[PDB]
Amino acid sequence: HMGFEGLADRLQQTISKIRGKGKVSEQDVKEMMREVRLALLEADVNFKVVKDFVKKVSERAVGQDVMKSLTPGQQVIKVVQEELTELMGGEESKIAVAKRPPTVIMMVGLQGAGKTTTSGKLANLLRKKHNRKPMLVAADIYRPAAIKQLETLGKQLDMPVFSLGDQVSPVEIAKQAIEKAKEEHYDYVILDTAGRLHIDHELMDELTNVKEIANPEEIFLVVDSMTGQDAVNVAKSFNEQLGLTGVVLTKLDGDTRGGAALSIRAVTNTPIKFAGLGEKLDALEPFHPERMASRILGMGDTLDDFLEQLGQVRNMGPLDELLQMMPGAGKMKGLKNIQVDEKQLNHVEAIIKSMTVLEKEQPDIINASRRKRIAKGSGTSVQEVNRLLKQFDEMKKMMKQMT
Amino acid sequence: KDPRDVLKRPVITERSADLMTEKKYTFEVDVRANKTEVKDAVESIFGVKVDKVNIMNYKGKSKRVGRYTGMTSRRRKAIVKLTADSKEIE
Amino acid sequence: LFLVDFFTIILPALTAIGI
Amino acid sequence: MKANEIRDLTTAEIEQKVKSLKEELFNLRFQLATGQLENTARIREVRKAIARMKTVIREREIAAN
Amino acid sequence: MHVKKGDKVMVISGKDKGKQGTILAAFPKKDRVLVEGVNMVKKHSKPTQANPQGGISNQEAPIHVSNVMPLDPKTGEVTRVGYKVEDGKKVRVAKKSGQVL
RNA sequence: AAAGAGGGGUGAGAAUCCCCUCCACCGAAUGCCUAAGGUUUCCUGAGGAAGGCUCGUCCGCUCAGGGUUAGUCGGGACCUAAGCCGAGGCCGAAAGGCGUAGGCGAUGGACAACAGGUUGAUAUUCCUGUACCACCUCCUCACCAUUUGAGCAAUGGGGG
RNA sequence: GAGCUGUAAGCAAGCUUUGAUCCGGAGAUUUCCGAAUGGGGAAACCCACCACUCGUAAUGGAGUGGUAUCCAUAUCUGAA
Ligand SMILES: Nc1nc2c(ncn2[C@@H]2O[C@H](COP(=O)(O)OP(=O)(O)O)[C@@H](OP(=O)(O)OP(=O)(O)O)[C@H]2O)c(=O)[nH]1
């Protein structure tokens, strides 16, 4: 949904020049790449990653006109898209599933990254998308309000939150937590671990002790996307002093650059598994490097009863499959239209639910005063009613043309 | 002569697309083109091996707008048919 | 095109189809 | 661009840029006919460029003879 | 055409007599010029791209250029024009003074 | 000039439009190929202001897309009849008329593909199987002789 | 010296004070028929020869330039 908006803005005007011109020249690719290189540098992408990326794209883009003279510029875009995709990890990296339940997932990171919130988001995702039965664990004893924060999120999910207070070691908390999860048949155990503002020795000593007693199948670093290269460095230090298997990037809804997301793989070899997209518990999505690459480049992929079904499936029934979300991402690339219904759509739905069942079955049976009364009940005098009838006639004509 | 200006523009139709699926491509060539040089020009530009070139030419449709009674220009449709195990044409 | 017709109907319901 | 065409060397690279330019034009017409070309002044400017680079060749030859 | 796009025009003739305005568009083929604020007319239109509402719309109609005089910058009063080379490009010297435009 | 009748279907609207079931007409044709001619009328999706000796939702009308595929079929890259033009020429107030060599000119001569399948519109033309005619040599095989010459024929005789 | 892609009300795109569109003088290209002129032809078409280039193993195919008649001059050959 969210992220990278600033890099896109920059790239997409240089992309404009090449896409329109089918012809590929030595000077054209050089020029596009100079702009691409400046945009990646200003987005705080790792410096070595930039210089390697500009090299591999430019090499492929001048054998590509030799590759193909058909749709040549649209070929240059496909190379950039393919390299952006590899740069953010090849393909979706799915959650591990232990051979024997429970799967123990360790959440680590620095204070303020979003550990505690993301723990709750991941539990939520495991139950809704995968039909799992998770358990949250309170292993950060070093701040007050930390436990109560997790417990509060747990009460909104109806999921247990294991805690022994703040006078007991996190090694013991993790141990008992995992054994209760075995006895009571919980699929997943999510450990919310400690952390101050900066790494120290007595953070890593504790985290290695917890890994030891817990033998986790996944160790996720939760890291703030808006910190750019500082996030890449936090990743490097965690991956070296214990083992990371994954990364959760938080606060993409405030990250217009994307430096961290374009750099984590190449510097640490750790894959990005999820993105946080907001404060609520349901703002977590799997990281899909194709679709972000496509995003960055502006590249995509009974009349009354039918109206009621369209209103149900369009207003609150959003959620397509078979790459429907991928081709419809960003309003299907905007579609050259800057107007959304919103309250206009709400008024259209209110005008739609202004007629009887017979009027819904036969829309042409309404007399002039017959839907003058309906317009008085709806709020638009004749304008909304006649626009709705014109739209229904246009939809009928389109259905007759399609059939 | 130049191999580029032999082939003017392609034809995109449902019948044309069925011929694309059956591996015979269609083009529109200039009105004085030749079967041999359509074959030579498509082999020169696209680097594929052909079996046949099947050329017809079309008369002009008579189109009127109001008082004006003109005729659309003539076209020479040229179907090339590629070999087995050759590169496709995009 | 049933999917294209459904997308056009959704666009007309959201705002309006081009005529 | 005409001063650039005079100022560049005489014999062959005008022909190479005519040839290279011609391929782009051929590609460009195909894109317009299939209907997914965005900008249409490119066809016009490539045609004007081909015309001026041919007329610099003929002006050079009639000056040489 | 004695005026240019971006002048400080005071109109002479019409219903709108004697009001200020800046030229946004000159149409020298028809000798009409579009001064802002004059000939405010009501256009009816059913389609409008970028979120159709239809409705009446208030626009400006062009006026003929002989209902137009530019302004002398020193006194602010309208005057005729003249042309004089100021060591380089030609400039429009307004009458009754020596300054330009 | 002549035979329709009823039930469904669409539409705002029908005897007139589409489907069905009976009935009737032509059948050395009112059937099937194909010339001269016409020039897009052919096919599909829409329209009903004009054209339709009435209506019309229908069309040989109106709008937008599409559709005519050849070595063998017909004509050229082969021949000639009547006839026409005609280098030089012979005439003739001027323009021009006639005419030799030469050429043009099928309604004739010669000449290599056919039987099955296909789509809304093309089919000895596209697809499948099996062929045939003219020409060419990076090649493979046999024979002859590279001057007491193998082989080829020419716009010339002769048979046809 | 600031509006312009005609007629023509069009945004799918772009060009211009590093001087566009517009106006004048001199240049370049100027397909094909047409006295039409390589041969024919039913106007806008068909079929060639020679020389040099492109391509094929070669035949097929293409490009460029010559190829009408009469007259004047010059050269060669000059039949019964
Ligand atoms: N917009 C957005 N916010 C996220 C996201 N993930 C986490 N946060 C916010 O970051 C802040 C830290 O979250 P915690 O869950 O406490 O992280 P921690 O355990 O690592 O310390 C929280 O709000 P906070 O403390 O109130 O933030 P602030 O007031 O310090 O700025 C949280 O709402 C995300 O994906 N999008």
The 3 state secondary structure assigned to E22-79 is: CEEEEECCCCEEEECCCCEEEEECCCCCCCCCCCEEEEECCEEHHHEECECCCCCCEC
Which chain A positions have a beta carbon within 8 Å of B89's beta carbon? 70
Contact B3, B45 (CB under 8 A): yes
CA dist D54 and A388 (Å) reads: 60
- The residue type found at A250 is T
Which chain B positions have a beta carbon within 8 Å of A69's beta carbon? 45
B47 CA: distance to closest CA in chain D (Å):
14
A10: Cα within 13 Å, side-chain hemisphere: 18
- Sheet holding A134-138: strands in order across? A161-162, A134-138, A188-192, A103-108, A218-224, A246-250, A272-276, A284-286
CA of A284 to C1' of F73 (A): 73
CA dist A357 and A279 (Å) reads: 42
Q: Which of A279, A281, A285 to mutate to test the pocket of ligand 1 (most atoms within 8 A of CB)?
A: A279
Q: How far is CA A357 from CA A300, A348, A369, A375, D8, in A?
A: 41, 17, 17, 16, 80
CA dist A393 and A371 (Å) reads: 16
* Distance linking the first and last C-alpha atoms of chain E: 14
Longest dimension (CA), chain E: 55
Q: What is the dihedral of CA A372, A373, A375, A377, to 10 degrees?
A: 170
H-type alpha helices, A43-169 = 47-61, 64-67, 72-87, 115-130, 146-157
Binary contact (C9, A313; C-beta < 8 A): no
What number does the ligand 1 atom closest to the CA of A277 have?
35
Q: Choosing among D29, D32, D36, D37, which should be mutated to test the B contact, i.e. which has the most B CBs within 10 A?
A: D29
CA of A302 to C1' of F5 (A): 38
Say which DSSP state A225 is in: G
Residues 6+ apart with CB under 8 A from E25: E5, E33, E34, E62
Residues 6+ apart with CB under 8 A from A48: A266
CB pairs < 8 Å spanning A and E: 5
**Angle in degrees, CA A382, E60, E39, rounded to 5:** 105
For this PDB entry, the determination method is cryo-EM
**φ, ψ of residue E83 in degrees (nearest 5):** -125, 135
All structural domains of chain B: 2-90 (3.30.70.330)
Locus of tokens 């400080």: E8
Query: Using the CB atom, is residue E46 less than 7 Å from strand G?
Result: no
What is the distance, to the nearest Å, from the Cα of residue A59 to the centroid of all Cα atoms in its chain? 31
Can you count the helices (H) and strands (E) in chain C? 1, 0
A3 Cβ inside 6 Å of ligand 1: no
**Angle in degrees, CA A86, A104, A220, rounded to 5:** 35
The token duo for B85 is: 């195990």
Query: Using the CB atom, is residue D39 less than 7 Å from strand G?
Result: yes
What number does the ligand 1 atom closest to the CA of A112 have?
21
Residues 6+ apart with CB under 8 A from A181: A101, A102, A135, A189
Relative to beta strand A161-162, strand E90-94 is unpaired
CA dist A345 and A352 (Å) reads: 10
CA dist D55 and A398 (Å) reads: 53
CA of A253 to C1' of F55 (A): 69
Which helix (H) or strand (E) segment is A102 a member of? none
Looking at the complex, does the CB of residue D24 fall below 8 Å from at least one CB of chain A?
yes
CA dist E57 and E42 (Å) reads: 6
